[PDB]
Amino acid sequence: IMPPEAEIVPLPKLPMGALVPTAYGYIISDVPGETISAAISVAIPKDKSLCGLIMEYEGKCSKKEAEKTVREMAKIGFEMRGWELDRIESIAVEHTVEKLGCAFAAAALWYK
Amino acid sequence: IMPPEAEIVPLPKLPMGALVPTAYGYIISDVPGETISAAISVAIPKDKSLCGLIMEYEGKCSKKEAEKTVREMAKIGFEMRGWELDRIESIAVEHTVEKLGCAFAAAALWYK
Amino acid sequence: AEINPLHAYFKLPNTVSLVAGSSEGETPLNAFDGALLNAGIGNVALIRIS
Amino acid sequence: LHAYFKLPNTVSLVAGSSEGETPLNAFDGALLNAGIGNVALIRIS
Amino acid sequence: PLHAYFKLPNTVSLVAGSSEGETPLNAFDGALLNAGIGNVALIRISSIMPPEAEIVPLPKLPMGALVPTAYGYIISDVPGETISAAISVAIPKDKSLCGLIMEYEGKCSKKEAEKTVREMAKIGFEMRGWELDRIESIAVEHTVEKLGCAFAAAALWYK
Numbered sequence: 001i002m003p004p005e006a007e008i009v010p011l012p013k014l015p016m017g018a019l020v021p022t023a024y025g026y027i028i029s030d031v032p033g034e035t036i037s038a039a040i041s042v043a044i045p046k047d048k049s050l051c052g053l054i055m056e057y058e059g060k061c062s063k064k065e066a067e068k069t070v071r072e073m074a075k076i077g078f079e080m081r082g083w084e085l086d087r088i089e090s091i092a093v094e095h096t097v098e099k100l101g102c103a104f105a106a107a108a109l110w111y112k
Numbered sequence: 113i114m115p116p117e118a119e120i121v122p123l124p125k126l127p128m129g130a131l132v133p134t135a136y137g138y139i140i141s142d143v144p145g146e147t148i149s150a151a152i153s154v155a156i157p158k159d160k161s162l163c164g165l166i167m168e169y170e171g172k173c174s175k176k177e178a179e180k181t182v183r184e185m186a187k188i189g190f191e192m193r194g195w196e197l198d199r200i201e202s203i204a205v206e207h208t209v210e211k212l213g214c215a216f217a218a219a220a221l222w223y224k
Numbered sequence: 225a226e227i228n229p230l231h232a233y234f235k236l237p238n239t240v241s242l243v244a245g246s247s248e249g250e251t252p253l254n255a256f257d258g259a260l261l262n263a264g265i266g267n268v269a270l271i272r273i274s
Numbered sequence: 275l276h277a278y279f280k281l282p283n284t285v286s287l288v289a290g291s292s293e294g295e296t297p298l299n300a301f302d303g304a305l306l307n308a309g310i311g312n313v314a315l316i317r318i319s
Numbered sequence: 320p321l322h323a324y325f326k327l328p329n330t331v332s333l334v335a336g337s338s339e340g341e342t343p344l345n346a347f348d349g350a351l352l353n354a355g356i357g358n359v360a361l362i363r364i365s366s367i368m369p370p371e372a373e374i375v376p377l378p379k380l381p382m383g384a385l386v387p388t389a390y391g392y393i394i395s396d397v398p399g400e401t402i403s404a405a406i407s408v409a410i411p412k413d414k415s416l417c418g419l420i421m422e423y424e425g426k427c428s429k430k431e432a433e434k435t436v437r438e439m440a441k442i443g444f445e446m447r448g449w450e451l452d453r454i455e456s457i458a459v460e461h462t463v464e465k466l467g468c469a470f471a472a473a474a475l476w477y478k
């Protein structure tokens with residue numbers, strides 16, 4: 001969950017060793033040649049007094065399919081709440097294992 | 113990740129019910145006679161402005177192997193960052209399951 | 225004398241202690257609890273960091 | 275002068291991947307590649 | 320008493336809920352929503368609560384709060400299957416001691432679930448050799464339709 005009135009900004013310069021509340025998803029695979037992906041989405045409400053919903057997804061698929069999936073999960077979360085959706089911010093990454101790899105996607109919450 | 117300059121100290125007298133940030137590894141097994149281990153390593157940098165790195169490991173093996181592995185994992189973490197390693201502190205424990213046992217290792221962060 | 229690291233984000237830990245322990249239990253959670261206890265951190269709430 | 279309690283007010287989206295000798299080293303390499311390799315994450319759910 | 324929110328939580332609330340979902344994460348989310356803590360971020364903690372923390376009904380939590388929460392959950396996509404989650408809080412007689420939280424989840428009835436989590440808390444005190452004051456708990460069961468989740472938690476906050 002993203003606190004109401006929070007702002008999506010580029011990762012700030014975090015203090016070394018800070019304890020950062022973070023929503024993330026990851027997948028690890030040792031299958032040579034396999035493509036694995038991780039994705040994160042943030043559903044932002046039109047009603048700014050409501051919070052934002054963070055959804056994560058990981059799987060043995062392309063980053064395109066992972067981002068599509070995680071964005072739909074966020075959409076569903078807002079429908080379940082019956083909240084008007086402003087938009088969804090999402091990010092995804094894919095990795096093709098060589099020997100043993102990990103794909104990781106996160107939403108780091110901090111303070112400014 | 114451990115904050116720069118954090119000092120390795122004997123576990124202090126922790127207040128009852130305190131919230132303690134902790135990196136840990138554990139393994140639970142319900143197979144009689146089976147041996148299980150857990151280990152923690154803390155890699156300290158020569159550059160004191162840099163973070164310490166904590167690695168945890170758990171598996172069905174001796175404490176000697178588990179500690180050897182977690183120590184290797186910390187060294188690898190430093191090599192991936194290109195940081196000069198000062199030393200590595202590690203601890204391991206092994207448990208021979210009777211009916212249902214758990215092996216646990218941790219790096220508890222605290223204040224001083 | 226108390227602190228909630230989740231709220232006091234500006235106050236970072238400055239000590240680290242390595243502990244370990246093990247234990248049997250009638251359930252997985254109870255075994256886990258026994259191990260933390262054997263390790264010395266069974267009477268605190270652990271916030272797992274990764 | 276007087277610390278005021280507050281909820282997080284910023285959210286950043288990061289992602290990364292990496293190979294590794296072990297699952298945890300690969301995970302570590304991924305966070306590093308994502309740009310959050312030198313902070314401790316408290317996973318929220 | 321200033322900076323109260325920077326000290327340890329002083330209340331605990333037992334909640335539980337269940338729900339179906341198009342995905343496991345959406346079902347889990349639906350379950351949290353159904354339990355009353357769907358709009359806060361949960362920080363899963365080990366099963367210990369501060370000494371003398373007061374058990375109270377879930378308070379009105381600010382959206383986005385980072386709530387230290389001990390919880391148990393189970394997700395199943397097997398039609399007709401019954402899943403349950405239970406949570407228990409064991410208060411010690413010695414007020415200087417911490418309280419114990421135990422969570423449980425499984426393919427059983429709400430009744431069996433609560434009975435089990437209550438026994439687990441008792442064992443927690445026996446292993447410590449502490450005198451028990453009492454144990455409070457709640458359970459929830461859900462019969463999967465397509466994809467469902469049973470959730471039980473002990474949320475720590477401030478009074």
Ligand SMILES: N=C(N)NCCCCN
Nearest residue numbers: 113167274302311313314
């Ligand atoms: N860089 C981090 N904070 N975490 C990733 C590595 C985790 C080692 N236990």
Ligand SMILES: N=C(N)NCCCCN
Nearest residue numbers: 054055056319348357359
């Ligand atoms: N409502 C919550 N805080 N969590 C429900 C699960 C959503 C995980 N991104």
